[PDB]
Amino acid sequence: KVFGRCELAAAMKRHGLDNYRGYSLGNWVCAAKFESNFNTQATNRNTDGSTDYGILQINSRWWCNDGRTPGSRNLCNIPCSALLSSDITASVNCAKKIVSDGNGMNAWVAWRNRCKGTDVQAWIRGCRL
């Protein structure tokens, strides 16, 4: 599923990401935009043999099991395919763990490079939230 901007904002809010670990909703929408272009089905292979999955491009070395990744820990206890569903529940649950891991949203290099320090609330402008 390719979410609209406000559509994804509402879903993320509903699932408790607005201000989660102190990161406002705009931060999460901005991260999604640059990670996946709001596409749940996005995948990208990494040099180490892991792959990133879903709207928040969650990686298969630490977080989810894809059966092909060296050194996998599956800390979210989920198949990586669950992160490609139209239902963002699994991605959100796994993103809550990730952002709690010590480095906050810096765990998303696209967030650090493209969202951090910017006017992230622009990403929820116009939405009825």
Consult the annotation and say whether 101 binds a ligand: yes
8 A C-beta contact, residue 123 and residue 30: yes
Please, which experimental method was used? X-ray
Between helices 5-14 and 25-36, what is the axis angle to 10°? 130
From 78, 73, 99, select the one nearest 17 (Cα to Cα): 99
The secondary structure element, H or E, covering residue 31 is helix 25-36
Q: How many distinct structural domains can be found in the chain?
A: 1
The CB density around residue 11, as the number of other CB atoms within 10 Å, is: 17
The residues, ordered by sequence, that sit 6+ positions from 20 with a Cβ below 8 Å of its Cβ are 28, 96, 99
Structural domain of residue 89, as residue ranges? Answer: 1-129
Could you give the angle at the alpha carbon of 51 between the alpha carbons of 92 and 84, nearest 5°? 40
CATH number at residue 11: 1.10.530.10
Distance of CA 58 to the CA centre of its chain: 6
Q: Tell me which of 7, 18, 35, 119 is the catalytic residue.
A: 35
Annotation marks residue 52 as catalytic: yes
Resolution in A: 1.6
> How far apart are alpha carbons 10 and 17 in whole angstroms?
10
